[PDB]
């Protein structure tokens, strides 16, 4: 039970990590990639990628 639960919890937090904004303008990629100029878009994308 510990193996199954702990593996599932690790995967769950991995998926949950996509919600966090990581100090960028926003989390969902398409919104920033639409509502920002390509210059600033590259910077925000770089932040999210790292």
């Amino acid at each position: 039970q510990d193996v199954v639960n702990q593996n599932a919890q690790a995967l769950n937090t991995l998926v949950k990590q996509l919600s966090s904004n990581f100090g960028a303008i926003s989390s969902v990629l398409n919104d920033i990639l639409s509502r920002l100029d390509p210059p600033e878009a590259e910077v925000q994308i770089d932040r999210l990628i790292t």
Partner: protein, 44 residues
């Protein structure tokens, strides 16, 4: 030859009619831009 207010528009990623319609600089490294005044050249 360009307007005096278009110097801010010749750059990687500048929003405006002049660059986005006539000459848009590629958003990459650019050797560089040189300019000066032509008050005795043309000033049509």
């Amino acid at each position: 030859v360009i307007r005096g207010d278009e110097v801010r528009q010749i750059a990687p990623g500048q929003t405006g009619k002049i660059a986005d319609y006539n000459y848009k600089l590629p958003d990459d490294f650019t050797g560089c831009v040189i300019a000066w005044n032509s008050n005795n050249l043309d000033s049509y």
